[PDB]
Amino acid sequence: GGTPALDRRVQDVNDTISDVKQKWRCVVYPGNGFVSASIFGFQAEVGPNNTRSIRKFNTMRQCIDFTFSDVINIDIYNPCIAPNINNTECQFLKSVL
């Protein structure tokens, strides 16, 4: 036996997140392509007037490249609570996790 050498200078978000529903994963958004989802909602972009719109992607690759790059300052649209409560979007979110 023995312990695998581990270089912790290299960051990996998966090290600490123990709840699998808290991890972002890319899923087919049946209506419009692919979205980045977790229990917190969808990764979002600025809406019409300082609001929040679901960020959509045309390929799983673009969604994955966005999801696992270090980009931060990203807003989250959560359809399960107000403001902007969409019951069907919330139900979809719950069904894909």
Binding site: P4, V20, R25, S38, I64
Partner: protein
């Protein structure tokens, strides 16, 4: 007969011979596995239960080879559940963006990390050898 020191040195020579034998066996088993399989030399994300690893066969030695995490061992993407699509997708991201830092079971991993991978459990090298 021999002093405790001479017997200890005999055992380190024995470890060398055993590791060499194991590496050669696994090389030959790799050729036998890669006989009729395309994409054998191309990285694939493999589920080891607790983690994902992006691995392939080395083209020179036919030994298992993984995307490496820095200067340590293979990059093992920790799963938080039996089904973890996020960890698998991060492994795909590794294949796309981090595939030029690699590590190979055997003498390479021995030189680089001080163990060959084949005589410790659990370890991706040993787990493949049991398959």
């Amino acid at each position: 007969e021999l002093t405790r020191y001479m017997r200890i040195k005999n055992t380190v020579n024995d470890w060398k011979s055993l590791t060499d034998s194991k590496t050669k066996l696994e090389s030959d088993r790799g050729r036998l596995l890669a006989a009729g399989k395309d994409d054998i030399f191309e990285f694939k994300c493999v589920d080891f239960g607790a983690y994902f690893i992006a691995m392939r066969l080395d083209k020179k030695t036919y030994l298992p080879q993984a995307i490496r995490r820095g200067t340590g061992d293979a990059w093992m993407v920790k799963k938080a559940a039996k089904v973890d699509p996020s960890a698998q997708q991060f492994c795909q991201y590794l294949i796309k963006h981090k595939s030029n830092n690699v590590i190979t079971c055997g003498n390479e991993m021995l030189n680089e990390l001080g163990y060959s991978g084949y005589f410790m459990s659990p370890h991706w090298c040993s787990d493949l050898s049991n398959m």
